[PDB]
Amino acid sequence: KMFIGGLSWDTTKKDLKDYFSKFGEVVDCTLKLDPITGRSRGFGFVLFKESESVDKVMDQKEHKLNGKVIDPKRA
């Protein structure tokens, strides 16, 4: 479970899940942008399938999906 802060207002568990599908096999993914109630905090979560996959995406938190960076952490 790694946290991803920096998602855009139009981010989706799909674009993020895949952008991260390059690090390893993710079993879960989410987007914290409740843009319906006005709670789009451009920030969701990512749940890799194996630690190695997470440690990799963490080795380089210079991420930039949706045209923005993200705060990669231990979701």
Residues 27, 49 contacting (CB under 8 angstroms): yes
Task: Please name each of the domains of the chain with its CATH number.
Answer: 1-75 (3.30.70.330)
Instruction: Name the 3-class secondary structure at 75.
Output: coil
Return the closest-CA partner of residue 11 out of 28, 38, 30. 30
Return the closest-CA partner of residue 45 out of 73, 21, 15, 8. 73
Spell out the alpha helix ranges (H) of the chain.
13-19, 51-59
DSSP 30: E
For 49-53, the CB contacts below 8 A with 24+ separation are 49/24, 49/25, 50/24, 50/25, 52/24, 53/23, 53/24, 53/25, 53/26
Give the integer Cα–Cα distance in Å for 34 and 55: 28
